[PDB]
């Protein structure tokens, strides 16, 4: 795919949730369907577990490599942490390519 990632013929499947309709007071019969319902919302917890396979580096390069580091000059906040109001801060985009290999 153009955005990035893994292209799959059979992807992890769509998961769908709805609140069941609960009706308001009805005192008479009609063929026409009920349009009056009690107002409701739902809340809960979800857990996702994922397994990943890793490929190890086998480099023979003598000199030291480039690495991602936490490096800031005179910082006024910690990046990837909450602020005084409680809002999360994420200033930098992070890629995967820091290691080097010969062609």
């Amino acid at each position: 795919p153009a955005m990035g990632g893994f292209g799959l013929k059979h992807p992890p499947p769509m998961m769908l949730i709805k609140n069941t309709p609960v009706p308001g007071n009805i005192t008479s019969f009609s063929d026409v369907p009920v349009s009056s319902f009690i107002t409701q919302y739902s809340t809960g917890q979800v857990t996702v577990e994922m397994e990943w396979e890793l490929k190890k580096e086998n480099s023979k390069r003598w000199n030291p490599e480039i690495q991602y580091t936490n490096n800031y000059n005179d910082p006024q906040f910690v990046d990837f942490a909450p602020d005084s109001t409680g809002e999360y801060r994420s200033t930098r985009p992070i890629g995967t390519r820091y290691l080097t290999r010969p062609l």
Binding site: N58, S59, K60, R61, W62, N63, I66, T100, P102, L103
Partner: protein, 103 residues
């Protein structure tokens, strides 16, 4: 053989206790310069005697200039393990080709 010059004589003699060092790059850690149409292969005619080519490589260069980059890499051959041979000694290797289509 050891070569000595005194006052322009240039005598040549055998050294029995001297060694040669040999290795094969099995995991492809080194840059591979063999498949680029360069000279130094074994000769077409069996009686002809040949000089071996010297190993070298190009890494990264900065902005189409002679200067290097932080990604640029140095490789040491002496970091790999090698067999040591005197005049009595010999070296052998075996390889199998992967399945490929017929020409």
């Amino acid at each position: 053989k050891e070569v000595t010059v005194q006052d322009s004589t240039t005598t040549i003699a055998n050294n029995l206790t001297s060694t040669v060092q040999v290795f094969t790059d099995d995991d492809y850690q080194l840059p591979y310069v063999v498949g680029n149409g360069t000279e130094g292969c074994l000769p077409a005619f069996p009686p002809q005697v040949f000089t071996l080519p010297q190993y070298g490589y190009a890494t990264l260069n900065r902005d189409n200039t002679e200067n290097p980059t932080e990604r640029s890499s140095f490789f040491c051959l002496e970091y790999f393990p090698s067999k040591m041979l005197r005049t009595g000694n010999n070296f052998e290797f075996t390889y199998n080709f992967e399945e490929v289509p017929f020409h």
